[PDB]
Amino acid sequence: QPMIYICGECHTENEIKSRDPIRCRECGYRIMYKKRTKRLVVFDAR
Template sequence: MDSQPVEPVSYICGDCGQENTLKPGDVIQCRECGYRILYKKRTRRSEQCYPVLKLVGGRVELVKSCSMKLVDS
Protein backbone atom coordinates (compact mmCIF):
# COMPACT_ATOMS: atom_id res chain seq x y z
CA MET A 1 0.00 0.00 0.00
CA ASP A 2 1.45 3.37 -1.07
CA SER A 3 1.07 6.10 1.50
CA GLN A 4 1.37 9.62 0.18
CA PRO A 5 3.53 12.06 2.14
CA VAL A 6 1.47 14.34 4.36
CA GLU A 7 2.04 18.06 3.82
CA PRO A 8 2.36 20.16 6.97
CA VAL A 9 -0.51 22.52 7.77
CA SER A 10 0.07 26.15 8.82
CA TYR A 11 -1.32 27.45 12.10
CA ILE A 12 -1.12 30.85 13.80
CA CYS A 13 -0.39 31.12 17.53
CA GLY A 14 -3.27 32.63 19.50
CA ASP A 15 -0.84 34.52 21.76
CA CYS A 16 2.22 35.74 19.84
CA GLY A 17 0.90 35.40 16.25
CA GLN A 18 3.86 33.29 15.10
CA GLU A 19 3.20 30.95 12.17
CA ASN A 20 3.70 27.27 13.01
CA THR A 21 3.61 24.30 10.64
CA LEU A 22 2.41 21.00 12.06
CA LYS A 23 2.17 17.46 10.74
CA PRO A 24 -0.06 14.72 12.14
CA GLY A 25 1.32 13.57 15.49
CA ASP A 26 3.09 16.86 16.28
CA VAL A 27 2.45 18.51 19.65
CA ILE A 28 -0.10 21.32 19.35
CA GLN A 29 2.03 24.06 20.85
CA CYS A 30 3.63 27.26 19.55
CA ARG A 31 7.33 26.74 18.90
CA GLU A 32 8.04 30.39 19.78
CA CYS A 33 6.17 30.99 23.06
CA GLY A 34 4.74 27.58 24.05
CA TYR A 35 1.10 28.71 23.90
CA ARG A 36 -1.22 25.76 23.24
CA ILE A 37 -4.02 27.45 21.26
CA LEU A 38 -3.32 27.56 17.53
CA TYR A 39 -5.65 28.74 14.77
CA LYS A 40 -5.60 27.10 11.35
CA LYS A 41 -4.58 29.43 8.54
CA ARG A 42 -6.96 29.74 5.65
CA THR A 43 -6.10 27.75 2.58
CA ARG A 44 -5.20 29.59 -0.61
CA ARG A 45 -8.10 28.09 -2.58
CA SER A 46 -11.39 26.80 -1.41
CA GLU A 47 -14.35 25.62 -3.39
CA GLN A 48 -17.90 26.03 -2.15
CA CYS A 49 -21.25 25.48 -3.81
CA TYR A 50 -24.27 27.65 -3.24
CA PRO A 51 -27.65 26.62 -4.61
CA VAL A 52 -29.60 29.17 -6.64
CA LEU A 53 -33.30 28.85 -5.84
CA LYS A 54 -36.34 30.39 -7.53
CA LEU A 55 -39.91 30.66 -6.27
CA VAL A 56 -42.30 29.42 -8.99
CA GLY A 57 -46.04 29.26 -8.29
CA GLY A 58 -45.58 28.77 -4.57
CA ARG A 59 -42.86 26.13 -5.05
CA VAL A 60 -39.14 26.51 -4.64
CA GLU A 61 -37.12 25.17 -7.57
CA LEU A 62 -33.40 24.65 -7.86
CA VAL A 63 -32.19 26.75 -10.79
CA LYS A 64 -28.53 25.76 -10.63
CA SER A 65 -25.79 24.92 -8.23
CA CYS A 66 -22.77 27.10 -8.82
CA SER A 67 -19.16 26.72 -7.83
CA MET A 68 -17.08 29.63 -6.63
CA LYS A 69 -13.35 29.77 -6.06
CA LEU A 70 -12.30 31.91 -3.11
CA VAL A 71 -8.77 33.26 -2.92
CA ASP A 72 -7.18 34.94 0.09
CA SER A 73 -5.83 38.39 -0.56
Protein backbone atom coordinates (compact mmCIF):
# COMPACT_ATOMS: atom_id res chain seq x y z
CA GLN A 1 0.00 0.00 0.00
CA PRO A 2 1.24 3.54 -0.85
CA MET A 3 2.12 6.20 1.72
CA ILE A 4 1.60 9.07 -0.69
CA TYR A 5 3.59 12.01 0.60
CA ILE A 6 2.64 15.18 -1.22
CA CYS A 7 5.62 17.43 -1.75
CA GLY A 8 6.06 21.16 -1.38
CA GLU A 9 5.21 23.44 -4.35
CA CYS A 10 5.13 20.72 -7.03
CA HIS A 11 1.67 19.77 -5.74
CA THR A 12 2.03 16.11 -6.81
CA GLU A 13 2.34 12.82 -4.91
CA ASN A 14 5.91 11.85 -4.02
CA GLU A 15 4.59 8.37 -4.08
CA ILE A 16 7.44 7.01 -2.01
CA LYS A 17 6.14 3.97 -0.11
CA SER A 18 9.35 2.22 0.99
CA ARG A 19 12.70 2.62 2.76
CA ASP A 20 14.37 4.56 -0.08
CA PRO A 21 15.46 8.14 0.69
CA ILE A 22 12.89 10.97 0.63
CA ARG A 23 13.09 13.25 -2.38
CA CYS A 24 10.30 14.17 -4.74
CA ARG A 25 10.86 13.10 -8.40
CA GLU A 26 11.04 15.97 -10.92
CA CYS A 27 10.77 18.59 -8.13
CA GLY A 28 14.04 19.67 -6.51
CA TYR A 29 12.66 20.00 -2.95
CA ARG A 30 13.33 17.50 -0.22
CA ILE A 31 10.70 18.38 2.30
CA MET A 32 7.65 16.12 2.39
CA TYR A 33 4.32 16.38 4.12
CA LYS A 34 2.36 13.17 4.73
CA LYS A 35 -1.15 13.30 3.04
CA ARG A 36 -4.59 13.26 4.82
CA THR A 37 -6.06 9.87 5.90
CA LYS A 38 -9.02 8.50 3.95
CA ARG A 39 -10.36 7.30 7.31
CA LEU A 40 -13.52 9.21 8.26
CA VAL A 41 -13.64 11.42 11.36
CA VAL A 42 -16.45 13.59 12.66
CA PHE A 43 -16.97 17.11 14.00
CA ASP A 44 -19.84 18.43 16.11
CA ALA A 45 -21.19 21.84 15.16
CA ARG A 46 -21.53 22.68 18.85
